[PDB]
Design a protein around this ligand. Structure first.
Ligand SMILES: CC(C)c1cccc2c(O)c(C(=O)O)cnc12
Length: 436
């Protein structure tokens, strides 16, 4: 398959639903390349667990952990890594309040080349155990011979865009990785990079990041079709930010407007997929799955209008209806959900912090967080649209959507999972209630 989009292995589903899945030990195995050095960009780390996922023969190779932690959290991460002399740390600067380093990425330098992995999982055991998570695996990128002068660039500009993303950190440990990427040939890449980085972007930088980056790519590299206003937008996420007092404040004004863009010219249904309380209760993990779905009652009660958009998590297509989602995806299906105009897998949840919010009379895009995803556009594959794969693991130009379509609206008795209130009416799959 040309897409190289995978789900993580889930403990407890039948083998047929893990056949094409990847565990972190598979990604780091010597079958993928002979590791020389790696960088792990992430939010949450269990360093003892993480080192055990590398093959024994590679556990002393240098590892860089790129994180956003401050103060006591930073001390704790440094303490975790001190037993391992080969581990260095890079603290991503977060100069805007309430920002986080959410990007999940592996840079894997081998004897044979370089690989880039952009994914959705934290580096802790529970994120790879019984969750639905997404992985994009780059090709093996060869080294450019010393003395040869070539760009190593792809038609999607992935090499320059990844270097731009790393340059935004202004970090000495990542200048070394930038130099590594410069030395490799990434021309075979068929995905577009969509990143967020903290800052206030105007003028020539406005389209570099966040939902304006998505808008720019859709304007330039997708085409509008007749009846485009009948093609829904689907957003699927594991937490929600404060979006405002009504949909016109951000969700259906600037966010949806970027998501609806197609082509260069100047009432679309919006489906938002987010686990209900029942989804969490009956899940493989039970209520503890809700520890990774951090929607607070304080936020939720200020935006009850939002929940009329919510649809249940359902993933019979991939055997994962009971594996709660930590993947985030956004896509543009046809009115009958048989095709899609594009697909994005990302770390970005449904929040202004991740996607950006316009400021200063619409001239400035303010982003609080680091995020990273990859965009699949039919034009990058020589196609007008992607056919949707009917079963995720069945069966080559059909795109494997990991959850069921069309999405199913919350029932009248359903409620969105809200993590900091108690659920004491019905026990979960392990026999427990939820008392925060
Ligand atoms: C809001 C914070 C405290 C949080 C709680 C639980 C899970 C989180 C998570 O999974 C991520 C992430 O992976 O991006 C980021 N923040 C998470």
């Amino acid at each position: 398959n040309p897409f190289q989009f995978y789900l993580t292995r889930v403990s407890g589903v039948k083998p047929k639903y893990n056949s094409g899945a990847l565990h972190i030990k598979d990604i780091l195995s010597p079958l993928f390349g002979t590791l020389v050095s790696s960088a792990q960009f992430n939010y949450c780390f269990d360093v003892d667990w993480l080192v055990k996922q590398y093959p024994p023969e590679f556990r002393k190779k240098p590892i860089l952990l790129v994180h956003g932690d401050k103060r006591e959290a930073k001390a704790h991460l440094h303490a975790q890594a001190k037993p391992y002399e080969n581990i260095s740390l890079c603290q991503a600067k977060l100069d805007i309040a309430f920002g986080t380093h959410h990007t999940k990425m592996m840079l894997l330098l081998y004897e044979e080349g370089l690989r880039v992995v952009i994914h959705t999982s934290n580096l802790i055991h529970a994120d790879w155990h019984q969750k639905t998570q997404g992985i994009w695996l780059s090709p093996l990128y060869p080294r450019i011979a010393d003395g040869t002068h070539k760009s190593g660039e792809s038609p999607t500009h992935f090499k320059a865009d990844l270097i731009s993303y790393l340059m935004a950190y202004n970090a000495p440990s990542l200048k070394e990785w930038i130099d590594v990427i410069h030395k490799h040939d990434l021309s075979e890449t068929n995905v577009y990079l969509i990143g967020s980085t903290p800052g206030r972007f105007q003028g020539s930088q406005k389209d570099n990041w966040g939902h304006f980056r998505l808008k720019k790519l859709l304007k330039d590299h997708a085409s509008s079709m007749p009846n485009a206003e009948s093609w829904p937008v689907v957003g699927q996420f594991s937490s929600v930010g404060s979006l405002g007092a009504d949909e016109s404040k951000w969700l259906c004004s600037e966010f949806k407007e970027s998501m609806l863009t197609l082509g260069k010219e100047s009432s679309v249904p919006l489906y938002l997929i987010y686990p209900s309380v029942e989804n969490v209760r009956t899940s493989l993990e039970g209520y503890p799955a809700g520890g990774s779905l951090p929607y607070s009652i304080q936020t939720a009660e200020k935006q009850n209008w939002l929940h009329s958009y919510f649809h249940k998590w359902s993933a019979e297509t991939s055997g994962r209806s009971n594996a709660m989602p930590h993947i985030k995806t956004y896509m543009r299906p046809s009115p009958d959900f048989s095709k899609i105009a594009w697909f994005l897998v990302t770390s970005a949840n449904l929040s202004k912090a991740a996607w950006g919010a316009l400021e200063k009379n619409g001239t400035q895009l303010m982003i609080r967080s680091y995020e990273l995803g990859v965009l699949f556009l039919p034009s990058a594959f020589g196609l007008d649209s992607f056919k949707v794969k009917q079963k995720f693991f069945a069966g080559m130009a059909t795109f494997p959507v990991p959850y069921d379509l069309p999405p199913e609206l919350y029932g009248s008795k359903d409620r969105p999972w809200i993590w900091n209130i108690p659920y004491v009416k019905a026990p979960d799959t392990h026999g427990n209630m939820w008392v925060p």
